[PDB]
Amino acid sequence: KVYSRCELAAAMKRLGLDNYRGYSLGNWVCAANYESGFNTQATNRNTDGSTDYGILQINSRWWCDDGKTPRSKNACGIRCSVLLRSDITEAVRCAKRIVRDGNGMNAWVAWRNRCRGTDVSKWIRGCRL
């Protein structure tokens, strides 16, 4: 599923991400934009044999099981395929765990790159929620 910006904002709001560990909703929408273009089916392969999955490009070395990544630690306890589904419930649950790991949203390089230190409220402008 490719979400629209406001559809995703509303879904993430409903699933409890707004101000999760102090990160306002716009942070999460912005991160998703730059990680995956709002596409739950996005995948990106890396040189350690890992792959990033889904709308928040969650990595298979550390966070999910894709059956083909050496030294995987699958800390979210999920098959990476669940992160390709249209329903983002499981992706959000994993993202919450990631952001409890100790680095906050620094876990998402696209967030560091394009969202950190910007007015992230623009990402929820115009949305009904």
Numbering used by the authors: 1 to 129
How did the manuscript describe this experimental structure?
We have solved the crystal structures of two of the three isoforms of lysozyme purified from Pekin duck eggs (DEL-I and DEL-III). The duck egg lysozyme structures have the basic fold of the C-type lysozyme characteristic of HEL. In general, the duck isoforms contain approximately 20 amino-acid substitutions (of 129 positions) relative to the chicken enzyme, and were thus considered to be likely to maintain essentially the same fold.
One of the crystal forms of DEL-III was also of interest as it crystallized in a cubic space group. The reason for this is related to the fact that position 100 comprises the additional arginine residue. Numerous phosphate anions, present in the crystallization condition, can be modelled, including several at crystallographic special positions (corner of the cube at the threefold symmetry axis), which act as crystal contacts that help to glue the crystal together. These phosphate positions are contacted by the guanidinium tips of three pairs of arginine side chains (residues 97 and 100); each pair is projected by a different lysozyme molecule within the crystal. DEL-I and DEL-II also bound HyHEL10 with a similar affinity, which represented at least a three orders-of-magnitude decrease compared with HEL.
